[PDB]
Paper text:
pmcMaackia amurensis seed lectin (MASL) is a plant lectin isolated from seeds of the M. amurensis tree.
Here, we present a high-resolution cryo-EM structure of MASL revealing that its tetrameric assembly is directed by two intersubunit disulfide bridges. Each monomer harbors a calcium and manganese ion located within the external loops, resulting in the tetrameric protein structure harboring a total of four calcium and four manganese atoms, as shown in Figure 2, A and B. A structural comparison between previously reported substrate-bound MASL and the apo form of the lectin obtained in this study shows that the overall rotameric positions of the carbohydrate-binding site residues remain largely unchanged (RMSD = 0.56 Å). However, in the apo form, the Y250 residue is rotated approximately 90 degrees, closing the carbohydrate-binding cavity and creating a steric clash with the position of sialyllactose observed in a substrate-bound MASL as shown in Figure 5, A and B. The flipping of Y250 is presumed to occur as part of an induced fit mechanism, in which the binding pocket reshapes itself to enhance molecular recognition.
Numbering used by the authors:
A (entry chain D), B (entry chain A), C (entry chain C): 30 to 273
D (entry chain B): 30 to 275
The structure:
């Protein structure tokens, strides 16, 4: 509650402390696969979500304290066709009872089913969007991007990101509550490249007192499929008290 | 999984990260009450259990790694009648799907319903037994005690403990896996007294790979009731890898 | 040794756990001032260095283990004249017995006194260079930059950085040893801007087994002076063992 | 300062982050030896002290905040003659500039040189005293003990302790500042035995704002020598802020 820190360097099949929604699963080799894979090939129209079992406490209505946190993970996106990719994944905080919305949720990364932004969603996400289509995703920019989503698919702030096929990406997301700042960074040590972005968000009005952290991913047409994988994931959060 | 640490200095009503079984609840003042209390008075035949939402990983069958951990909490036992008290409470590790056994479970601290020890229980507990009755609890010693229970109410090792009515007790439980040692200590800073005990247990054969940690408490006849309360609770565990 | 973590949210005068070289000092208000300030005005030709008292263990020659670490701090650079600024500061790892080189060390940020790179220096730094002069600093680029220095002032990799006068900057430096990667990030939450850079370095050949971490800063001519301040600083490092 | 945590599972020769006073040293095998050992035999009249390089912040005079901390370590005491042992060792907090007092400091575990208690010492120690002599140590009880020392060799509180020759002991010392309580526990997993003690101390009046943590050990006559060794040592302290005073 006040403080919560965990680290998962490797995953196991049917992991107990992870709640899976959709078709997400963990392979025998120990890699967390949000999209089902048959004989080394990704499938089409596959949506997956994983969450940590324990809800995370963000703020208190009585005292007014608000939590600042930081997390880091390693993920891989590998597509048979480098030219075009489908949708992508995201790291998101949602209500504990959040479930997959009904209907077509591919272009929304399995988080929403409507393009409009509503304050009732109470979802705060950092998306790694690899699909820059204009007809299906008019809101997204022309290039592959890393964006911050607050109660809507239309990201308040995005940064151009150069995706590498079969490349391990080390991502870090840090929220500073006193400064009301969300920072997302991604690093490719294979080419030694960095992409960073920051935004101004206040979790008091957006998210409830208790939330759940996790990952989401989606896929589209069979021709433009891809594989999303997570190898490690570390999280730490503390609820500092304000006497003011 | 590999590492998990949390700290709860204060509790809130309907806490999300705590699973309650029986009649356990959290008061408005922020104290975790395993036994229901009416207008400042404990009730009779009340059994309560609380667990952490996230299961804890102890060991791996493939690598052979085993986790060592440590936890600390503060609890209060306050009875209207200091002469005689009912049952008591315990800090226990059990399977994630553990539920309250049917039948009379008061004298067993809400963990078992049979006096015999069976390896299928897979429950490892540290009990603070305040009831020294001989007819109902022939297994327990003549004095109030702190005991270690492994797959049975009959504690493998117990230490005499002087209970103080309305006294805050600071307890610490530490498991060292390489040495296969479980250590339980209790401190009263109001009188500056300490009671410690150690035992030899191996969680490989007893508990499964994934377990849940928490507290349990029970009460008996109305004349000899008592109030069990928990004010704070901190836990930390790491899964160190063995290359041997 | 194996693990070391500390956090200093506020500083105190004549702090015991900080070793000061040059004219660095801590103000009564609790801000770490590397450059001496008279009545709210910075001085000229002022060089300061601060280090943590405890040396940090990086690697072992026998086992071959190498440490990965992460640190974060907050710093402020405030100059009376926004047009031109002097030198700058840096976060550096050096030998425990490192001292200020003799001679003009202003343009070298108080770390070196020669422009050439020599492997005997054994200094690894992340510099926030605010002086883009060409005659005095031909090696530096045309713009204010954040650079990574390995045994020389000429940074192996630099990133353009927009300096803000009187603006609080939150910086984070993370070294991953298995991937041999050094990452430096800087954030301005007042304007919500981020600047990140990564480089490939191996501390085995560069630094010795035991090093000291800290900060350095320098100033130049009186007309182009500036004030360097540090408000908070957190560091954490672990020495993970490799069984390969 | 506000928070400081470190862990040393193994030691190395000439360790940089440890300050050694006296004849303490680290062996090639990686064990911290406070008393010099020749060819596997302890020596006589050997006094050693080790401290962590970084001073530890306990309290602030302005805000009034006071730090609570916890530490754990593993130590071995092995004597050729189990019948009688010399002096012992202790885990102590002292001023950063503390040095070995001049004169005979064997019976005082290398911390003091006078039996009387003076508030100017500013030393807070947890001693594992293995010498129960009455003529040389009239203050100590009749049995081997674990004691808490505050500005004096005469321990305010002691607990009987059964020493095991060549036995690994796991010790844990925890200070709770809001409750002003110091707790010391020792465990032998080889026989599964525990010895615990608690005392009431306030570091505000005793120790200064900045202190240094470490270990001390001493030896006596050649016939009753022993070897003191430390295998691992972990420390963690945090300075929690109190808004009641402010
Ligand atoms: C992220 O988080 C915080 C907010 O939570 C951001 O805001 C800064 O936080 C600091 C510390 O809380 C605050 O600094 C305050 O500045 C006040 C005014 O500054 C005086 O001193 C300077 C000295 O040069 C003068 O230039 C100036 O003219 C003023 O005279 C001070 O009054 C404050 O002191 C206070 O101390 C205690 C509380 O600790 C109070 O009880 C006192 O009454 C007193 O008021 C304090 O020093 C300030 O809110 C922000 N800093 C600024 C404006 O510089 C952080 O900026 C942000 N951190 C990041 C991004 O790293
Ligand atoms: C809790 O956990 C551990 C077990 O997990 C308990 O067991 C001790 O652990 C240590 C360290 O692993 C082991 O110590 C070993 O002792 C071996 C023999 O000792 C030699 O050296 C002494 C020096 O005085 C001589 O007296 C003696 O005659 C022997 O010559 C050594 O061989 C071991 O060294 C090994 O190092 C590496 C591994 O790190 C190996 O690759 C080498 O091949 C080499 O074998 C090692 O030093 C031993 O298992 C236990 N310690 C003993 C018996 O003293 C801990 O006791 C327990 N900790 C607690 C309760 O605090
Ligand atoms: C930062 O740090 C590490 C290096 O320290 C970087 O390197 C990766 O680290 C991982 C894990 O150590 C290594 O992955 C290895 O890949 C080997 C080959 O891959 C097989 O499996 C895939 C499955 O799709 C096939 O595609 C492929 O064709 C191969 O069949 C495996 O053999 C390795 O498994 C090993 O497991 C144990 C050790 O844990 C060994 O004992 C076994 O013998 C077995 O060899 C292992 O899975 C690999 O070194 C690097 N990953 C790669 C190449 O994908 C990290 O990339 C870097 N992390 C960042 C930047 O986040
Ligand atoms: C180690 O540390 C602390 C001291 O630092 C020791 O002292 C206890 O700490 C708690 C929490 O700070 C304090 O509890 C206080 O008790 C007050 C009175 O109790 C009322 O409620 C009970 C309910 O049964 C009634 O029985 C009783 O008659 C009273 O009606 C309360 O007033 C306090 O509430 C306060 O909350 C906030 C601060 O958080 C204040 O702003 C409010 O004004 C309000 O006063 C509070 O609940 C108390 O100091 C000590 N606990 C006691 C006496 O029970 C710890 O005991 C010690 N911990 C160990 C050894 O584990
Ligand atoms: C886009 O997403 C929204 C939100 O999901 C979606 O609106 C509704 O969401 C709910 C929850 O997923 C859908 O779930 C069920 O649909 C049927 C018919 O309602 C029933 O199984 C359930 O309805 C009963 O239970 C509700 C409990 O709140 C009651 O409110 C209700 O009165 C019924 O008793 C349950 O709602 C629901 O189907 C959709 N609504 C519709 C018309 O489908 C929205 O539909 C999505 N818009 C798209 C894809 O265009
Ligand atoms: C002491 O504790 C043991 C263990 O609880 C207890 O044995 C049985 O435990 C189960 C689980 O709590 C009891 O629960 C239910 O009882 C009835 C009748 O069986 C049904 O609701 C359920 O039985 C069905 O579901 C089971 C699923 O495994 C099937 O195995 C079974 O075939 C049925 O389909 C469920 O079991 C169960 O009642 C008790 N057994 C009895 C006779 O009560 C034991 O009874 C306790 N001994 C005491 C109090 O003396
Ligand atoms: C650029 O930096 C280098 C490295 O500092 C510098 O070379 C020498 O560095 C040392 C250490 O700071 C200087 O320090 C002293 O200088 C005088 C004369 O040597 C003496 O105080 C000392 O010399 C004695 O002690 C040394 C110990 O190693 C002995 O090696 C020596 O034989 C003497 O006994 C000590 O060295 C030293 O002055 C400089 N060398 C010179 C000529 O100044 C180098 O000078 C700098 N280059 C610049 C500014 O152009
Ligand atoms: C028991 O312990 C106390 C405390 O150590 C001891 O008193 C004195 O302690 C100091 C510090 O260890 C001893 O150190 C030196 O002794 C000589 C003579 O004084 C000098 O080297 C030094 O004295 C000079 O420096 C001092 C700095 O404070 C000045 O105060 C002084 O005026 C001198 O300029 C330094 O003190 C000191 O020797 C002892 N005092 C004596 C008489 O030895 C005490 O002696 C011990 N009692 C025993 C063993 O019975
Ligand atoms: C917080 O407390 C105030 C008390 O007036 C109440 O009005 C408000 O509804 C509460 N908000 C939440 C989310 O509980
Ligand atoms: C990264 O390095 C590899 C080396 O083979 C190279 O093939 C690839 O083109 C590089 N990618 C980028 C974006 O530089
Ligand atoms: C552990 O692995 C071995 C492989 O032979 C298997 O026999 C055993 O059943 C496994 N144990 C568990 C609890 O999975
Ligand atoms: C503890 O201290 C209080 C002080 O009032 C006293 O009443 C009580 O008897 C003491 N309890 C024990 C076991 O010493
Ligand atoms: C490391 O060990 C090898 C052993 O052959 C030795 O040659 C080498 O000099 C050592 N390196 C250092 C820096 O001690
Ligand atoms: C940052 O915000 C302030 C608001 O007053 C503005 O003055 C300043 O120009 C901004 N700086 C940048 C680089 O946008
Ligand atoms: C603490 O502050 C007060 C201010 O009046 C002062 O009198 C006292 O000497 C200070 N104590 C210490 C140890 O600095
Ligand atoms: C501890 O166990 C060993 C087993 O050999 C035994 O020799 C020794 O006497 C025991 N010590 C105590 C105090 O029980
Ligand atoms: Ca898209
Ligand atoms: Ca009983
Ligand atoms: Ca420059
Ligand atoms: Ca003695
Ligand atoms: Mn997008
Ligand atoms: Mn019992
Ligand atoms: Mn530069
Ligand atoms: Mn003694």
């Amino acid at each position: 509650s006040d403080e919560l820190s965990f680290t998962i360097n490797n995953f196991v099949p049917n992991e107990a402390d992870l709640l899976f929604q959709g078709e997400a699963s963990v392979s025998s080799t120990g890699v967390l696969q949000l999209t089902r894979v048959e004989n080394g090939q990704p499938q089409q129209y596959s949506v997956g979500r994983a969450l940590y079992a324990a809800p995370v406490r963000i703020w208190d209505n009585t005292t007014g304290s608000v939590a600042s946190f930081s997390t880091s993970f390693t993920f891989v996106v590998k597509a048979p066709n480098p030219d075009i990719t489908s949708d992508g994944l995201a790291f998101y905080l949602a209500p504990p009872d959040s479930q997959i919305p009904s209907g077509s949720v591919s272009k929304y990364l399995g988080l929403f089913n409507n393009s409009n932004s509503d304050s009732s969603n109470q979802i705060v996400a950092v998306e790694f969007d690899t699909y820059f289509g204009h007809s299906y995703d008019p809101w997204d920019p022309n290039y592959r991007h890393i964006g911050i989503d607050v109660n809507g698919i239309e990201s308040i702030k995005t940064v151009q990101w150069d995706w590498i096929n079969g490349g391990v990406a080390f991502a870090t997301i840090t929220y500073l509550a006193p400064n009301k700042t969300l920072i997302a960074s991604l690093v490719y040590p294979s080419n030694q490249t960095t992409f960073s972005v920051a935004a101004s968000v206040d979790l008091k009005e957006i998210l409830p007192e208790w939330v759940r952290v996790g990952f989401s991913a989606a896929t589209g047409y069979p021709t433009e499929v891809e594989t999303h994988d997570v190898l490690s994931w570390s999280f730490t959060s503390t609820l500092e008290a304000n006497c003011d």
